[PDB]
Amino acid sequence: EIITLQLGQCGNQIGFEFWKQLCAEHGISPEGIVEEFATEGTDRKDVFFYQADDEHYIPRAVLLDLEPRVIHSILNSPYAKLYNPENIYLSEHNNWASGFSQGEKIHEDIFDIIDREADGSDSLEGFVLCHSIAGGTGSGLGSYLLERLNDRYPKKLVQTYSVFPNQDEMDVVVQPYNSLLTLKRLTQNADCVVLDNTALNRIATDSFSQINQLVSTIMSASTTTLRYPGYMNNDLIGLIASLIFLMTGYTPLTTDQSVASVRKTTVLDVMRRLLQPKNVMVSTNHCYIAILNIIQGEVDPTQVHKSLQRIRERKLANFIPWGPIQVALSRKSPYLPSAHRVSGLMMANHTSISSLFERTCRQYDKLRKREAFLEQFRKEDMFKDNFDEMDTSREIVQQLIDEY
Amino acid sequence: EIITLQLGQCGNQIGFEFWKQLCAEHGISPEGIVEEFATEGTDRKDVFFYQADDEHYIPRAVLLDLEPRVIHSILNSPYAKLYNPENIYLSEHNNWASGFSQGEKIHEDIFDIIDREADGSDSLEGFVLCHSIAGGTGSGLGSYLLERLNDRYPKKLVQTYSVFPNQDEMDVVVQPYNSLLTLKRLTQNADCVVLDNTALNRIATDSFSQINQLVSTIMSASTTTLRYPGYMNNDLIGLIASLIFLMTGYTPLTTDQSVASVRKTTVLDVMRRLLQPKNVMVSTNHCYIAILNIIQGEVDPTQVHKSLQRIRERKLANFIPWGPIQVALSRKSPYLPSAHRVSGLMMANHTSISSLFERTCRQYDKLRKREAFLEQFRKEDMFKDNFDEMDTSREIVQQLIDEY
Amino acid sequence: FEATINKFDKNFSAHLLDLLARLSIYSGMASVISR
Amino acid sequence: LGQGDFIRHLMDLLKPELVRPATTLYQHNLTGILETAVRATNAQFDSPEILRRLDVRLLEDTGWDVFSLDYHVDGPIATVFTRECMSHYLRVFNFLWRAKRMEYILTDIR
């Protein structure tokens, strides 16, 4: 089992479309009813859903937000009735310090909800977090929740889908501070999926609805095998151990109109495609640390071995000199059309990601020398006296970059 | 069998809606007729009702009041004909002393009614009292009746649903005196359910009709197993022995509009919910003395054992260091819809209740030093000479607080 | 009276620690301790 | 071990038990644990007949050296297995049990 903590407008939407994808996959009706064709289903549902006496299924989700508008719109959707009104929380009434201050203020009810959800699962495995690191809501609230959660639950995993601000595009003027602080908290508490609007929209090209549909696709494909038990990799901890910051790529990212080219898609061509920097959805002979490829559809392990052999000989990849990939196979949901003969998802750890922080650090250093937009931060208690928090966070990020 | 003594406007209403709930549960028509579908009923009716030669059922209730208006309205309700006009009593023509003086004045007819009702039951078990401790009517009249009843019937139980004045809201300006005196009498004569408007309305939020509907729900759920015989806990004395001041909480306190979220409701989640201070309907490492959980609906004792084990290990509760809970199961009435898969009611004795009196004492001490609003009290005979009654009551309450 | 109540405590609590002892050595009969 | 989903939960519940030495181990306790796993995992949606034969046996140290499933079969179907396939499956089941705890150890360290 698992819980999802989605914050800010970004996280709220991310959750909306993630649950849309899930209910589509598992044959869950918008109202929580189960379709007749899926009555005898074999798919495991406990992982993301828990059924109710009324036979309906409820997501293990909690909605958090500093503002009402987004969730109010969500509850006007056809999927509104599905969620649990008890879990959803809205502030009665764009800065990280303010977000953390509110988090300190509203500890009690949030952790009440979290405890209630936790006690309903026998074998909870970890946590899932969806949020954006730039905006005031996501950054600060995620920081506070991560801190108090790692404190509260020292034996549960914490996984996040953190969305990083666009850089080529000059959105949050105060983004460097929030990003740097959120990164501090991620290193200091997060167990383990980086995301950026820049490269994501780049691949989308070459509305937020479609972008986050792709993101939800990534999340669902990541959790597929856990959802669909097989032989190997039957747990999230198995995933994490096989890799341990990450980046992702998915081959069949094709529009509903781009099915006309039914290209004979082997496993070799897919696994190859997952390697190119173009497909890496995120934007010094930098090299890899780990690679995992989850493959959906018919697959012959002989083909997998041949592809691995050929790629190894062709040396299209580079590895650490000081240490000695993985190809897991799953089964598609029996419901969604198998427009793709075989499909592939890749999650990897690669040193080049360091550059991200070097940019943000460069951004942050490009402001701290002139004290820009610190007036609001001084208002909050945390930065009321000084900003030693900022210095510690910057040095922590520098240490991480040095370690990479 | 049992008798109900309800005083003051609060008690009068409390009784109205309590009997509404009872007749709803047992399939008793508003006029006292029995519905066709309930002709072969197995539910025990003698406990709260006695049938009549006309086949109608009459409650074992007596109406008392210093003023006519409330009961006059009651007799204009569709449920008017149900009650016994003989038992109902109305004064022909807001202070505790006046109430007790009238009680001394109208001893004869009240005890006539009580004796008549008592002699109609073979196995009367105890008494039930519903009243408010602040207003003049309830406080004084309940005091007088409790005194003369404990004197008259030294072998019957005396149970009360005492409503305590709101404190965050500054209603009876002379509330401290009435509350303190009623508490004196409760300690000195009452066998055994505290109630406050503050926390009650707090939970209602998060008219008197709905508040007292909830209160009647609490009372009925408390008396369920007695009404519905089973294996264990087949008597009120069994209840009292298993606990012995109390506080209460009920899990499925859901509006008629809040059934949309049909949450899969185990026994574990319910019994857990009954523990939180939020659900305790009332407002030094204070700890518990006793806990009882009555569960309605399908229940597997294996689930109960597992829930008890897990809660014990999680140590969510605290107990007295000097002494070594209870989970009883009942059956729902076969008539009211079972919108809840399994439901839970909790009655507990906890030391924190002491604080209540500390407030009222603080209130009373905050007045006795300046002799506020004593003019009316001096009028009555009881406080005509002195107020030693007040001093004795205050010292008794102080002794009780020290004992806690 | 004041001196015999404490005797029953030492007498009754001794038999109960015997009941909980034998009810533990078993392979239900193990869920009784949780009761 | 071709199920995977069921053996995962079954290795999480036998962990507190098998760590003790074999002398304190008695078969009548483990059956309640096995029955719990078959109820929680996806193996509950299964033919009741074949679930009647699946039980535990105690080989004759530590609890991770004497535990193994049996799946006894008697009757007409016993002419296909003939007491030798059941003496070969158990010879295999050890190698698949070891290579399964040597992995859940290495995902715990990770």
Swiss-Prot record, chains A, B:
Q: Which domain of life is it from?
A: Eukaryota
- Cellular localisation: Cytoplasm, Cytoskeleton, Microtubule organizing center, Centrosome; Cytoplasm, Cytoskeleton, Spindle
CDD domains xref list: gamma_tubulin
Q: PTM Phosphoserine: at which residues?
A: S123
Q: Where is GTP annotated to bind?
A: A134, G135, G136, T137, G138, S139, G140
Q: How changing L356P affects the protein? A: In CDCBM4; the chaperonin-dependent folding and hence the yield of monomeric gamma-tubulin is compromised
Kindly identify the disorder that the protein's record connects it with.
Answer: Cortical dysplasia, complex, with other brain malformations 4: A disorder of aberrant neuronal migration and disturbed axonal guidance. Clinical features include early-onset seizures, microcephaly, spastic tetraplegia, and various malformations of cortical development, such as agyria, posterior or frontal pachygyria, thick cortex, and subcortical band heterotopia and thin corpus callosum in some patients.
Q: What is this protein called?
A: Tubulin gamma-1 chain
Organism, by scientific name, is Homo sapiens (Human)
UniProtKB/Swiss-Prot annotation, chain C:
> Which residue ranges does UniProt annotate as crossing the membrane?
none
Q: What range does the record give for the signal peptide?
A: none
Compartments, record wording: Cytoplasm, Cytoskeleton, Microtubule organizing center, Centrosome
What tissues contain this protein?
Answer: Ubiquitously expressed.
Q: How does it assemble?
A: Component of the gamma-tubulin ring complex (gTuRC) consisting of TUBGCP2, TUBGCP3, TUBGCP4, TUBGCP5 and TUBGCP6 and gamma-tubulin TUBG1 or TUBG2. TUBGCP2, TUBGCP3, TUBGCP4, TUBGCP5 and TUBGCP6 assemble in a 5:5:2:1:1 stoichiometry; each is associated with a gamma-tubulin, thereby arranging 14 gamma-tubulins in a helical manner. Gamma-tubulin at the first position is blocked by TUBGCP3 at the last position, allowing 13 protafilaments to grow into a microtubule.
Disease affiliated with this protein: Cortical dysplasia, complex, with other brain malformations 15: An autosomal recessive disorder characterized by global developmental delay, variably impaired intellectual development, speech delay, facial dysmorphism, microcephaly, and varying degrees of cortical malformations including pachygyria, thin corpus callosum and subcortical band heterotopia. Most patients have generalized seizures.
Which family does the UniProt entry place this protein in?
Answer: Belongs to the TUBGCP family.
This chain's function reads:
Component of the gamma-tubulin ring complex (gTuRC) which mediates microtubule nucleation. The gTuRC regulates the minus-end nucleation of alpha-beta tubulin heterodimers that grow into microtubule protafilaments, a critical step in centrosome duplication and spindle formation. Plays a role in neuronal migration.
Protein known as: Gamma-tubulin complex component 2
Task: Identify the species of origin.
Answer: Homo sapiens (Human)
Q: Which residues of the full protein are shown?
A: 818 to 858 of 902
From Swiss-Prot, chain D:
**Expression sites (tissue/organ):** Ubiquitously expressed.
Highest rank taxon of the organism: Eukaryota
List where this protein forms a coiled coil.
none
Location in the cell: Cytoplasm, Cytoskeleton, Microtubule organizing center, Centrosome
Family recorded in the similarity comment: Belongs to the TUBGCP family.
Its quaternary structure? Component of the gamma-tubulin ring complex (gTuRC) consisting of TUBGCP2, TUBGCP3, TUBGCP4, TUBGCP5 and TUBGCP6 and gamma-tubulin TUBG1 or TUBG2. TUBGCP2, TUBGCP3, TUBGCP4, TUBGCP5 and TUBGCP6 assemble in a 5:5:2:1:1 stoichiometry; each is associated with a gamma-tubulin, thereby arranging 14 gamma-tubulins in a helical manner. Gamma-tubulin at the first position is blocked by TUBGCP3 at the last position, allowing 13 protafilaments to grow into a microtubule.
Task of the protein: Component of the gamma-tubulin ring complex (gTuRC) which mediates microtubule nucleation. The gTuRC regulates the minus-end nucleation of alpha-beta tubulin heterodimers that grow into microtubule protafilaments, a critical step in centrosome duplication and spindle formation.
Output this protein's name.
Gamma-tubulin complex component 3
Parent-protein start and end of this portion: 568 to 681 of 907
